[PDB]
Design a binder for this molecule. Structure first.
Ligand code: FES
Length: 98
C-alpha cells in the first residue's frame, strides 16, 4: 500500500502532499520527494522531528521519546513513523511539548 500524507506547516501556512509506502518512514519519503523536515537524532529519541496528527493513523512503535499521554494527544516522531492510513499531519511541533 501507498498512503497519501499531507504535511501542514501552520506557522508558515504551507501544505505539501506526498505519497508514502506503508513500509517507509514519513521523514524519508518527504525528503525523497523534495521536502526537508526538521530532524536531529533520526531515531525516535528526541523531539526535533515531532509533528501532530490532524487525521489518520501511524505506526511509530520504534519511538521511545514520547510518553503515553503525548501519544494520545496525537504527537508523532516523524523520523520513525509509518503511515497506516492516509494521514494529515502538522509538522514543526517540537515546541508544543514545552
Ligand atoms: S529526529 Fe529525534 S525523534 Fe525524530
Amino acid at each position: 500500500a501507498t498512503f497519501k500524507v499531507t504535511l501542514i506547516n501552520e506557522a508558515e501556512g504551507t501544505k505539501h502532499e506526498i505519497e508514502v509506502p506503508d513500509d517507509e518512514y514519513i521523514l524519508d519519503a518527504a525528503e525523497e520527494q523534495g521536502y526537508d523536515l526538521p530532524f536531529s537524532c533520526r531515531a525516535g529519541a528526541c523531539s526535533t522531528s515531532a509533528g501532530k496528527l490532524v487525521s489518520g493513523t501511524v505506526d511509530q512503535s520504534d519511538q521511545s521519546f514520547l510518553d503515553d499521554d503525548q501519544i494520545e494527544a496525537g504527537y508523532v516522531l516523524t523520523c520513525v513513523a509509518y503511515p497506516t492510513s492516509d494521514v494529515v499531519i502538522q509538522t514543526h511541533k517540537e515546541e508544543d511539548l514545552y
